Symmetry: D2
Subunit: 327 residues, 4 copies
């Protein structure tokens, strides 16, 4: 009769700990899901919570196998529950949020949440962030909006959400298109929803996949080395994402290596190290001439999520561009 709500715990600074409340030092992986739930007894006011510990890692070590395990579990257990919260490291939550946004086939709410302060800190942000994540997953209006991230009283879509600051509790922002809703006193005023296709409206199906296509990221800057790009090509990577300078521009020697790569079986996506705004067509690079794909507003690490999934469907740069214009 209260919403049934599953928490899938993956680790992160929300389950991490230091030897002092008032020193910054901490390590991830100290606290199980039972202990987090128990630190918020007010959850039983809003939901019937069930917690499982899928893994316990720092999200700096998030990987393809944990992504597959999560998407598979959510997809199989969808019918058991009214929604899911995933407790997660903050460092790569914006990656896992987008991978689930594209492969989750459950249109029931799936809410990701972490903490910028360890469980042991003075003014720890984890307990209230977890409360609000359950408020969100239990809100009937949260369904059909794609996979969500809830941080600092804010409901953010999985596609546009990113980290803006290294330490600030208020780091997570949807920096191009804004947030979906604000949470106040356990109620959400939703004024937006992602137009890009997600969840059950995407062709991606990882139900029977045990690995993903290999996709690396190369940085651009003055005097950039080509050695990173060469190393990925030498290893037969399925794709490379460029964190370009400005509007996805390539240092000349990186450009040389990725042009060869795009014409010899490696997919190439131009994104940007710049934190907001689209990597666009119709600027300084004719993507189609090189066989590149322009990432749009997807940053390097998001573009790598969508490129891995595009490559389960096609190697064709025109098709990949069509997928980067729809998802």
């Amino acid at each position: 009769h209260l919403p049934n709500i599953t928490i899938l715990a993956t680790g992160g600074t929300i389950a991490g700990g230091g030897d002092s409340a008032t020193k910054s030092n901490y390590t991830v992986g100290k606290v199980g899901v039972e202990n987090l739930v128990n630190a918020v007894p007010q959850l039983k006011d809003i939901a019937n919570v069930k917690g499982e510990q899928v893994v316990n890692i720092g999200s700096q070590d998030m990987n393809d196998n944990v992504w597959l395990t999560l998407a598979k579990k959510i997809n199989t257990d969808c019918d058991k529950t009214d929604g899911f919260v995933i407790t997660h490291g903050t460092d790569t939550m914006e990656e896992t949020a987008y991978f689930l946004d594209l492969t989750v086939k459950c249109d029931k709410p799936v809410v990701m949440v972490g903490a910028m302060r360890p469980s042991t800190s003075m003014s720890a942000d984890g307990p209230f962030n977890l409360y609000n994540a359950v408020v969100t997953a239990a809100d009937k209006a949260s369904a059909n909006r794609g996979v969500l991230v809830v941080m600092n009283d804010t409901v953010l879509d999985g596609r546009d959400v990113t980290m803006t600051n290294t330490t600030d509790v208020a780091t997570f922002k949807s920096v191009n298109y804004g947030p979906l809703g604000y949470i106040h006193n356990g109620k959400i005023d939703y004024q937006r929803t992602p137009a890009r296709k997600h969840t059950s409206d995407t062709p991606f199906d990882v139900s029977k996949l045990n690995e993903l296509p290999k996709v690396g990221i190369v940085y651009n800057y003055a005097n950039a080395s080509d050695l990173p790009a060469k190393a990925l090509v030498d290893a037969g990577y399925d794709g490379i994402v460029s964190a370009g300078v400005g509007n996805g521009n390539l240092y000349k020697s990186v450009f040389d290596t990725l042009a060869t790569a795009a014409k010899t079986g490696t997919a190439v996506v131009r994104s940007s190290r710049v934190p907001t705004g689209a990597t666009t067509q119709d600027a300084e690079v004719d993507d189609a001439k090189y066989g590149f794909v322009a990432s749009g507003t997807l940053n390097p690490q998001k573009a790598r999520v969508l490129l891995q999934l595009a490559l389960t469907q096609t190697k064709d740069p025109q098709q990949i561009q069509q997928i980067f214009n729809q998802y």
Copy 2:
């Protein structure tokens, strides 16, 4: 009127497209004199002399142009009242900090670019150039370090960065804010960078024709060690990590860089995250590994300072000292 020298390097500000109402352009259509002639009002505020140093897209900016530019300004400091450098946007933030650490001229040195090509409707380059010459003309600008002047704002070389791929308002000092705003050809300076620059740095490039080799590697989920293993296999002097969150490293990359740091490669941890410090005293024992924490320097600015450090030392603790002072 002061004497002001424009040193032109190319970029969108001197780039053009086939239409004022389409986004497509190539850099380097336009020479320095053409730019200057485009803004006749410069006459009202300065005696302007333009020289072309190079003509390239800043996406192709490199160690040799940096060395040329810093030598040029240091050689010619006595000869002018200040400098404006016209430059692409994409790496303006790297050139700005290189120069901020390496120019010993404490007269005004102001970088400027354009987010719209000189051909475009509502081109931003003319008023930008105009405001850059105002900044270089104001004696208040002296002793503030190398500056960037974009969208009516004066920003310090260390903190300035691009926030947006296309916005005319892209250039911000995202951690500590601007030094001043330009209104009607006057600046109200309320700020100056506390970090040591120009003649308070030990870095001199006057007889250097190259810089230590410093690469950047990106972190992300399931990150490849192969990029870092490449730079190490090549004998790179230094690698900056574009960390996740507070300068964190995927396990593979962590292992490779920890092994390199013991073989002598300098390792700085920075962050792909656009604002905030990569700090000591978080998840990574930097002293245990011989790693250096970048502070607020983003990965491309971290490279600038690591290259210069690497002209003076390979000692981690001594690199951390330099990353705490400049």
Copy 3:
């Protein structure tokens, strides 16, 4: 054919010129619409443009009479054009946008535009602003999103759009829920639409109105005077909006005057002087008990627009609070 677009000019810095190009002085409603078009020859590549001068005022002198004229004309002339651009000063464009967003029943694109620099200034922003406003009004995907403001290559909804900076060309932002779309190379990638009800989904109809209910705005600050609030009450005002401190809070003397007035026929809305975030219920003020309405994310000048309209339908606070939850 190319779409037929109507430019309705109201004046503004965009029609306004200075004495120099390189000094900050200018007059507003200097020159006219036909002058404004002729400065942008490229418009004829994208539409068949006709201009009409409605009024010629600096938007700091904007008023109910210009609002009523604008809305009736857009609603009357709707059938014979494919879309509208309204040239307007920047200072109060956010207020006119939300009035029009509520009272226009034309669901063809309605776009507001201005300029932050004068006509004659170096790097004048008006010409490209006007070009992109016509792109937006000409796009079929612009229909049914409400009244829009198009500034600095960005499409902003009438409701959330506001000024962030006194002089920056990039001043206009939707500071709570972000923009709907970015314009690049004459094309828009819409990824958002406002969920709050607008244009033909509102019951507001000003067709037969010649004046609007009287709504004043009072400011809160340390040691605030109650004299302004008392002056609007003595004048028999229909409504009062509070620019509160923090989360909509009231200086003691303002609390006293507004609480007295809310129980004897004056509608009272708590908004905030703070530039982003909702003035919420459930905080320090029990709105229901005083007969106050919480403005949500509407800032004082926006709350005033919605309060004047709500008072054309009802004087009941619970019903005004309902309108404030829906539009």
Copy 4:
């Protein structure tokens, strides 16, 4: 031997409390200074703290009498302590910070701090904020920087600090010139200091004053009533600050009232309701002619603070403008 730090408590949300850790409802001033101090036992690691509860009000009720009390106390008590922390409400902290920044002659560190969540909240921000405020008051490097605000791990100058968001724990930002330092692991890396004159470098001497000149604030907006302005003039106010539209512009009817009043000796400052950027001279308003002062980056409530203090030395509009260009 750790430093001696004086906490002066004035109330606010930092001292506030609600029925539930999870519900938003609260009231200010439920817990006293010693309770706040004992909730952060770790303060003994970094200082010898002495608390004095000076008043106990919501900062929505802050007033001239509390300002005078605080300035005279800090000034008298300077030589008995190494540094001051003032606990205060958030809503007007930015006003008090500025008044103290102009009236305090003690150049030892003086830090203000509050909380956006009440002390009873889950993930309450006050405890670690208070910890950080005392770190900042203990740090000698803070001396000579003017009065500070410490919130959300940031050191902010009293002049430029303002609220950005109605509820966000990260709401306090130096929105024009940025912050002075970030706090991490109990340490500050200061990279900035305000160039504007503060503390000992101002002429402002409140030592014998028991009242401050009367300064009100009137809001601009479409169709603005002249009644607020006329109410303040009728009452013989000593000055009026206008929260102008755009770059300090005034609606017709308010412009008429303020112009008439400056002619007979009322001090009139043009500020802007726009949250960032300066209200400049030499835009659309001839300040020289009307006897008006442009407020620069001072927002309306900040402008009030400096105008009241300008008015303790001069009523001469040109002398008041010179004060507005120096502080």
